[PDB]
Design a protein around this ligand. Sequence first.
Ligand SMILES: *[C@@H]1O[C@H](CO)[C@@H](O)[C@H](O)[C@H]1NC(C)=O
Ligand SMILES: CCCCCCCCCCCCCC
Ligand SMILES: CCCCCCCCCCCC
Ligand SMILES: CCCCCCCCCCCC
Ligand SMILES: CCCCCCCCCCCC
Ligand SMILES: CCCCCCCCCC
Ligand SMILES: CCCCCCCCCC
Ligand SMILES: CCCCCCCCC
Ligand SMILES: CCCCCCCC
Ligand SMILES: CCCCCCCC
Ligand SMILES: CCCCCCCC
Ligand SMILES: CCCCCCCC
Ligand SMILES: CCCCCCC
Ligand SMILES: CCCCCCC
Ligand SMILES: CCCCCC
Ligand SMILES: [Cl-]
Ligand code: NA
Ligand code: NA
Length: 552
Amino acid sequence: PQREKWSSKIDFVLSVAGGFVGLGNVWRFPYLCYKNGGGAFLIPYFIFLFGSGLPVFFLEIIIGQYTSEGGITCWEKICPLFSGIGYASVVIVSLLNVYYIVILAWATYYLFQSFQKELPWAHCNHSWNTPHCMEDTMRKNKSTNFTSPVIEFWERNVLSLSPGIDHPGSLKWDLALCLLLVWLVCFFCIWKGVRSTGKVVYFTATFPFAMLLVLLVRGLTLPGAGAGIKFYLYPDITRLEDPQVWIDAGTQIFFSYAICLGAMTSLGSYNKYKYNSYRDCMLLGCLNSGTSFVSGFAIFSILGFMAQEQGVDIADVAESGPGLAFIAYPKAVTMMPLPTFWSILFFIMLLLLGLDSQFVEVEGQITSLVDLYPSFLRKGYRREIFIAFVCSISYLLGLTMVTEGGMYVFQLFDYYAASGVCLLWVAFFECFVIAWIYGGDNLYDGIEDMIGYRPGPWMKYSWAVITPVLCVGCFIFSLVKYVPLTYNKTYVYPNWAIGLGWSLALSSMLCVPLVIVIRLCQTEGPFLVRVKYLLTPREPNRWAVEREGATP
Ligand SMILES: *[C@@H]1O[C@H](CO)[C@@H](O)[C@H](O)[C@H]1NC(C)=O
Ligand SMILES: CCCCCCCCCCCCCC
Ligand SMILES: CCCCCCCCCCCC
Ligand SMILES: CCCCCCCCCCCC
Ligand SMILES: CCCCCCCCCCCC
Ligand SMILES: CCCCCCCCCC
Ligand SMILES: CCCCCCCCCC
Ligand SMILES: CCCCCCCCC
Ligand SMILES: CCCCCCCC
Ligand SMILES: CCCCCCCC
Ligand SMILES: CCCCCCCC
Ligand SMILES: CCCCCCCC
Ligand SMILES: CCCCCCC
Ligand SMILES: CCCCCCC
Ligand SMILES: CCCCCC
Ligand SMILES: [Cl-]
Ligand code: NA
Ligand code: NA
C-alpha cells in the first residue's frame, strides 16, 4: 500500500505539539538551567535555538515530507551512504524510551501519594525523615545540615537514594509497579488506538498549559520571586568559558525538539506533499521554546522563594540534577489553597505531558523498525508480539533505574544515552549530508515546490555553516576541557560507570561509521566508484500520487 496521510493539518500540529512539548520543557530545562549556573545557560540556549534547533527540526520535518518515509528509509532515499543516521536515531530513541518512562513512574508515584488528607512532603515527622530535617518556615527561626522535608521525600521515600551506582540496593517494588503501570498504559495506547485522543484534543492540550499558568501565577506572587528571577535571567559571563554549559544548552534544544530521534521525520511523513509545514514548524517552535522559557519563570520563582524562606543560596536550595521539578513544584502546590487538589492536577498535568511524548517516541521507533521488515511486521498478530516485546525489554532495562541506586543510573542515561555528544554526532551528520553532500540549494528546490515558496537563507546557512560549527566546536572543546559527570555536584562517578556511560553514547555514534563500512563492502567495484554510487539520492520524491516535480 502506502503511508497514510494525516486526516487534516490540525492533526499534524497536535501530534507534533504533543510529541516534543512535555517533560523536556518542564522537567529537563529547569534543572539543566539550574545545574549550569543561572542565566548563563540562556545564551548558549538561544544561540543553539536560532542556529540549529529550529533549522534541524524543520529539516527533519521537510525530509519526512519530501521522502514520505520513516526515520531510516528517508536517509536511504536521501543518501544511501551515511544511512547509519537512521540507525543511530533509532538506537538513541530506544535508549530515550528506556529512561524517559522512569520520570513518569516517579510522577505516578507522587500522584498516588497525593491522595491523602495531608501531602507527605509538607511536614517531616514520618518514618523516612532523618532527624536532620527541619520545617522550612522554622529554618530561619531555628550548620548546613538541616534538610527540607521536600528533599527528604524525594531522596528517602521516592528514590531511597543509595550510596552510589556501585551500590544498586533492592528494587523499589512500589516504584516497579508504577513503572509497569505506565508501560501498560503506553502498550495499550500503542497497539489499539495509535492516535485515539481525538475526542479530548481540546482538554488534553489546553489543560497542561492551563495548569502551567496557575503555577506561574502562584510562583510569581511568592515573596522570594525577585531573587529567583534575577538568578534565572541575569547571566554569569565566567560560566560561559566552561564547555559543559554549551553541551547542556546545545543538547537541551535537540532533546526538547525531539530531533535526531526519527520521530520528527516520521511525523513529517504523515502530511500532504503540498502543505506549508515551514510556517507551522516555526509556530510550533515558538510554542516549544516559549513554554520552556515561560515555565522557567515559575520554577525559578519557587526556587527564589525557597531560598528566602530557608536563608540559603539559590544555587544550593534544591537538587542540581533530575528531581528539581520534583522538589520545586511539589513545594509550590503546598502554598496554594487546598494543596491536595492542586497536587493531583500537577502530577496529572505532568503525566499527560510525558505520556503524549512517550506515545510519539515509542510509536516512532516501532514504525521505523517496521519499515525495515514491512511484511514481517505490521501484519496480523506479528505486530502484537513485537510491540509487547519492545515494551517488555525496554521495561526490564528500566528496572535497573528503579532500585535504590537507580537514580545514579538515571543520571548516566540522561547525560549520555539520548543527549550530549550522541545528539551532536547525529545532528552534525544530518546537516552535513543535506548541506554539503545532497546540497543546501538543491533542497530549497524541493522545499519551494513543496511549501509553495523559496525560504530565506537562514535555513541554508544553518545547515551549511552554523550547525556543523556549533556541533563540532562544542564537541572538540568538551573533550579538551574534560569534566567527568557528577550527580548533585557531590557524587563522583567511578571509572567503569563513565565507561559504561560512553558505551551508551558510542553505541549510537558508531552506527554512522558501521553502515558506511557495511554499505561500502556490499557495493561492488572500485572504492571511488563505490563511494560515488552510494552518495547519489535514489529519487527522494518518488510520490506521483501527489502533484510533484523531481529530485533534479
Ligand atoms: C549539624 O551540624 C552542626 C554543625 O556541624 C552540628 O553542630 C550538629 O550537631 C549537626 N546536627 C545534626 C542533627 O547532625
Ligand atoms: C506584583 C507581583 C509580581 C512581582 C513580579 C516580580 C518580577 C521581578 C522582575 C525582576 C527582573 C530582573 C531582571 C534582571
Ligand atoms: C543567534 C545566533 C544564531 C543566529 C542564526 C541566524 C542566521 C541568519 C542567516 C544569515 C544569512 C547571511
Ligand atoms: C546496538 C548496536 C548497533 C545496532 C545497529 C547497527 C547497524 C547495522 C545496520 C545493518 C544494515 C545495513
Ligand atoms: C566541506 C565538505 C565538502 C564535502 C564534499 C562532498 C562532495 C560529494 C559530491 C557527491 C555528488 C553526488
Ligand atoms: C536497548 C534498549 C531496549 C531496546 C528494545 C527495543 C529495540 C530492540 C528490539 C529487538
Ligand atoms: C535569528 C533568527 C531569525 C533569523 C531570520 C533572519 C535571517 C537573516 C537574513 C534575512
Ligand atoms: C489559582 C491561582 C493561584 C494563585 C495564588 C495567589 C495567592 C494570593 C493569596
Ligand atoms: C536494527 C537496529 C536495532 C537497534 C536497537 C537498539 C539497541 C540499543
Ligand atoms: C505557559 C505556556 C506559555 C506559552 C507561550 C508561547 C509564546 C511565547
Ligand atoms: C541491576 C540490579 C537490579 C536488577 C533489576 C532487574 C534487571 C534485569
Ligand atoms: C570512553 C572515554 C572515557 C572512558 C573513561 C573510563 C574508561 C575505563
Ligand atoms: C511493558 C508491558 C508489556 C506487557 C505485554 C503483555 C502481553
Ligand atoms: C560532533 C561531530 C563530530 C564530527 C567529527 C567528524 C570526523
Ligand atoms: C517579570 C516576570 C514576567 C513573566 C512573564 C511570563
Ligand atoms: Cl527547551
Ligand atoms: Na506533550
Ligand atoms: Na521539548
